[PDB]
Amino acid sequence: DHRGMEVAEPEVLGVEFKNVLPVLTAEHRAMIQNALDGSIIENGNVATRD
Amino acid sequence: MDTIAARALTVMRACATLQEARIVLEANVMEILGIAINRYNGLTLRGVTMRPTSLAQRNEMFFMCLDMMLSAAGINVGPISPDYTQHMATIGVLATPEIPFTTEAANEIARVTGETSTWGPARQPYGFFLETEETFQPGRWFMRAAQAATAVVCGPDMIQVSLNAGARGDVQQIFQGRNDPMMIYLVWRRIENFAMAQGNSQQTQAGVTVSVGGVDMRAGRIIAWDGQAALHVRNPTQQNAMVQIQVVFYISMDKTLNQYPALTAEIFNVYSFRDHTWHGLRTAIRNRTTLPNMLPPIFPPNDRDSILTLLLLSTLADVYTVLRPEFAMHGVNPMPGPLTAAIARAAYV
Amino acid sequence: MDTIAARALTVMRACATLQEARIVLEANVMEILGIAINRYNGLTLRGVTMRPTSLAQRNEMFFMCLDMMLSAAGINVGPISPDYTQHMATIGVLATPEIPFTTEAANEIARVTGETSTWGPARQPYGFFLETEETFQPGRWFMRAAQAATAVVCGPDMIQVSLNAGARGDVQQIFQGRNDPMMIYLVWRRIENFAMAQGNSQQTQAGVTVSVGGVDMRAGRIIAWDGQAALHVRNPTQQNAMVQIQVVFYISMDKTLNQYPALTAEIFNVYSFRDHTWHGLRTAIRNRTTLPNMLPPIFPPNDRDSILTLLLLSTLADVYTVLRPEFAMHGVNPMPGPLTAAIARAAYV
Amino acid sequence: MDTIAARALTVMRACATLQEARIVLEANVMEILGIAINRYNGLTLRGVTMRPTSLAQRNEMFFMCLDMMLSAAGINVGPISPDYTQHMATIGVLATPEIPFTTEAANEIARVTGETSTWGPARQPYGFFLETEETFQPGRWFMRAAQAATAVVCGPDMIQVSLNAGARGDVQQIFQGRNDPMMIYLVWRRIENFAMAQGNSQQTQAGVTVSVGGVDMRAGRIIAWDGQAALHVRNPTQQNAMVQIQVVFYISMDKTLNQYPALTAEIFNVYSFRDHTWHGLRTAIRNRTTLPNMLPPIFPPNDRDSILTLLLLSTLADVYTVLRPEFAMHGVNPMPGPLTAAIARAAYV
Questions:
Q1: Range of the domain at D349
Q2: Are B242 and B139 in contact (CB under 8 A)?
Q3: How is the subunit organization of this protein annotated in UniProt (chains B, C, D)?
Q4: CATH number, domain at C271?
């Protein structure tokens, strides 16, 4: 759960980026973070769903 | 009261962002709507949702905006609908400091309140001599009995002065008494070929001169006249002469449509049709105001309330557009679906 | 975008396979609708079934195709039905390389985009001199003042030259200035028995000649005239002579109905009636387009969008047929009767 | 029922893919073909091979397609060959929902049944005034006794109106009563030079006006006339006048050759010769129909069964081509010598 939206945990995506994180510029870090909590669960707030 | 209006505006604008259902909202929005809606539903006892879908949900929300729109404008519409009912308490919701308002909304009101409460110079809309009863043929000589110089109106923004050879005189008084200008912008010309009392073509010889407050001015150039200086014309020529002095435009301390940014486009929006529902609503609302219920006022309003009301209503209009509300008002018989220019025309009584 | 259309097409085409309830489908269909319906129902949140049976299910499916058809065409119909509501999200599903598209569908779009983007030579539909204001009686002599040879129109694809005994001259300029042909195919004949200024029968002696660009051509044979060459007629005969030159057909770069395979039949299908619901639907759809809402265009379209739209609609038409959907439409009133040629006639305004 | 046709169709088009298969590409097809052939061979007791090679095997497969094609068309040809016998059971084979059909076949049928069951606007093929018993000379004056304006037919798509100086009148009634048009497309011109009752040339002065339903129209331009609006011609000129009005094309709800994509080409394919065996077969089949046994119908059919039958035959035709079937046929005598346009011409009675 994040800001009224249900998003996917970075684990269900398709990437190994943990390696990179430590060398990131405050800027780059931020960008990526948004991309992460960017990918949402489309339908999200619906319940029922399936 | 500025604050109240600002909020009511902010809220409506926010609801306008709900174009679709599953879309992500701008953080700022959710924050506002939340506090607002809850507090509203609190003092209202209504069931507004932050994410409407049904219709009845949308109606409820629209009703909310409407409730606020009216309250902010201080309008009591009365029993106009079997579906909608105005809750006077809405005002208390707009007065709660907890509900914020955008910077946009703040500045917006500050502008309205600002200009409305004071005056300023503005390019007036119509010709200077528009409110004239008598007008003369342009280019036709005319000398009033016993006068050597005879100035007279020949159009809404036109005057011509008939001069006898060797004659001269002040003209200003033809302008004075009308309106209350601050600066009249003139441009005079010589009527090179004009009609004589009998009908014969007469020439105006080069050499005639017009001077304001003593200083001589060129023809075909714009002159900043204060309306009080001496408007003196001289005909040193050995023939009759006729000159046309034109009020290209003037400025007064009256309110024009340029008092507030794109006020025009807003007014258009309010007065636009959309459908019988919107129409009848917008109408019935203005019936509580000094504004024409369905036709753009000839003259631009000048009081806070009017300007405000227009803006609010204009916005509530857009809200109506996105929300697609559906309900009835007493005396409104809606034709659904395919609307045509024709059907619209007919709607304006 | 081509891809998007190809998909939307492929899907509809596959939905057209559902003529019955229990029947087994070709694996290809299952694969297509399987993926499609999944991602569709996914972002749509509607309940489409591979195997519809009820009606409500059939409607839902038809709406799906309709959604895609509109989205592929880039149309925003607006509130046209209380039962159907267009989903803009549909486009997002088509842009998704997830859903496949048949090879046929691929080439179909590839052709549309192909020709629609460039030009080419095509046999024009009507007579060359169709846009003429003045026409002369065929076979009747007519010699303009001071001329020895006088060519003039006598039909939509007909001209006749009046030659005095021993006269000769160029004719080309009668054709020029009209349209922009690339090649005009002619065939000249001798007006063996024509009327004279007074009404008496006159013979055209065998010996008159017509040479293009210098070379002499036979009568009754087709001629590839470049519209620029020297169209010269000679009358070495000792009598008056009149000859008719015929524009059997010409070619220009204007788009005909043969720009894309069986475009005609499609257009017929789209414009056909079926029933009120279909009719008004098809109409209401084209109301968003440059196409005549219910009557075949006089002139064949020439832009991608138009052709495309027709194709999609035509397919969507067939889908409508197999699905037998039933739903409301603003302003449309269905007559339950079995439907006759007459009832259909009436429907077209 | 249509489903049955789709099936049969699918089968044939599929059989027409074994010119040499060597691992088919279309898995779809195979699945179906196998299924079908098994079902067929089961109820038939015949031995159709997946990969025919002999001739007897090829004939067998052909006979199958024939059986299905006939069953799909609802045709019982009877004893027309000592080698082939029609199995009515074939219908029971296509009735099984076990058998799938291509998306192609599905759509192909959906189109046929679709349009064939309803009506639609279409450009008619021949001139408007084609079914007229009497015609007049073009350009020649003619004024019926007591009338000041006399309209008359001068061609299959041409009329001319004789107006006396200062005369006027409605013309529409000349068109009415003929056919049942929905929209007629006109283009009127002035007959600049025409023959008089005696034979002398006469000029039509510029100023003649043709107005439809009240509005005045230009000459040489196309006009959308609904057939009911007032077609009025006025002669404000001080001389006689003759104007020609042309039906460039009209549209009605009568089925044309464009009711179904490339129907034309298909028909050609059916009515084409190939060889004696095919010829007599194709004939013998159509003898059970309402369609001409060996000469293209003058009028395009309008019923499902018609169109369908043609399609099935057109396809079965190709199947015949690829398979090279060889068998006897009552009343047919094969001439094996290479075959020429001459030998073919003869075969058509």
A1: 254-349
A2: yes
A3: Homotrimer that assemble in a complex of 260 capsomers on an inner scaffold composed of VP3.
A4: 1.10.170.10
